[PDB]
Amino acid sequence: DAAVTPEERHLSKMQQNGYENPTYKFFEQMQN
Amino acid sequence: GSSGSSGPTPKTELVQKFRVQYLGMLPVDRPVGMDTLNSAIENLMTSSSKEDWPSVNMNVADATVTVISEKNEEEVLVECRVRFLSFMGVGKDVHTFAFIMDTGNQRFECHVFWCEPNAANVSEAVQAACSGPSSG
């Protein structure tokens, strides 16, 4: 299994996994 | 009956800046959520047109995401502080990039954009802004 593009990952990642800003600190509910 | 508030002002610093497009503003429910974001991109996508999306300038500093008019430079459009920012990602196309921001109350607004080619640099300048995978 070859390694795909590095950047693409950063994107593909967000496209799904996305991104949750921690600094925000959303009262209640402690992200796993 | 009474109230008051105040705040400091920004200074002069080298900003990354990122010329892109403005899909528009899409309403959301939660401050986070993938289906909550995509929905926007999708909404705006169909909602407005591709050519409709005006040209803007996404300012990305140490930890601040501001949308200043393309033409004017002293004409802010959207002030998304990496601190305020809650969620951010892309839709079905990496060429797009949306993010949720808390204006004040529990209310949350999402701002999509059209980067070219992809939104790797943009999202990057944002992801890194938030904090990134340890830069220092």
UniProtKB/Swiss-Prot annotation, chain A:
Residues of the full protein shown: 739 to 770 of 770
Residues covered by region (Interaction with G(o)-alpha): 1-13
Cytoplasmic topology ranges: 1-32
Impact when changing G18Y: Impairs interaction with DAB2
Domain of life where this protein originates: Eukaryota
Record note on what altering Y19G does: No MAPK8IP1 nor APBA1 nor APBB1 nor DAB1 binding
Impact reported for N21A: No MAPK8IP1 nor APBA1 nor Dab1 binding. No effect on APBB1 binding
Region of interest (Required for the interaction with KIF5B and for anterograde transport in axons), residue spans: 18-32
Segments carrying motif YENPXY motif: 19-24
Protein name as it appears in the record: C31
Residues the UniProt record annotates as site (Cleavage): D1, A2
Phosphotyrosine carried by residues: Y19
Organism annotation: Mus musculus (Mouse)
Per UniProt, location of the Glycyl lysine isopeptide (Lys-Gly) (interchain with G-Cter in ubiquitin) cross-link in this chain: K25
Phosphothreonine PTM sites in chain numbering: T5
Effect of Y19 to G/H/V: Greatly impairs interaction with DAB2
Region (Interaction with DAB2): 18-32
Curated annotation (Swiss-Prot), chain B:
Domain PID: 12-130
Shown residues within the full chain: 582 to 704 of 760
Subunit structure: Interacts (via C-terminus) with APP (via C-terminus). Interacts with APLP2 (via cytoplasmic domain).
Tissue occurrence: Expressed in the brain, retinal lens and muscle cells (at protein level).
Protein name: Amyloid beta precursor protein binding family B member 2
Consequence of gene loss (knockout): Knockout mice develop cataracts from 16 months of age with defects such as ulcer-like anomalies in the cornea, and opacity in the lens cortex or wider lens. Decreased muscle strength, however clasping ability is unaffected. Impaired spatial memory retrieval and learning. Reduced branching of hippocampal neurites and increased fragmentation of neuromuscular junctions. APBB1 and APBB2 double knockout mice show progressive retinal lens disruption from 1 month of age, morphologically lenses show massive vacuolization, lens capsule rupture and disruption of the lens fiber cells organization.
Sequence intervals crossing the membrane: none
Lineage, uppermost ranks: Eukaryota, Metazoa, Chordata, Craniata, Vertebrata
Localization annotation: Endoplasmic reticulum; Golgi apparatus; Early endosome
Function, in words: Plays a role in the maintenance of lens transparency, and may also play a role in muscle cell strength. Involved in hippocampal neurite branching and neuromuscular junction formation, as a result plays a role in spatial memory functioning. Activates transcription of APP.
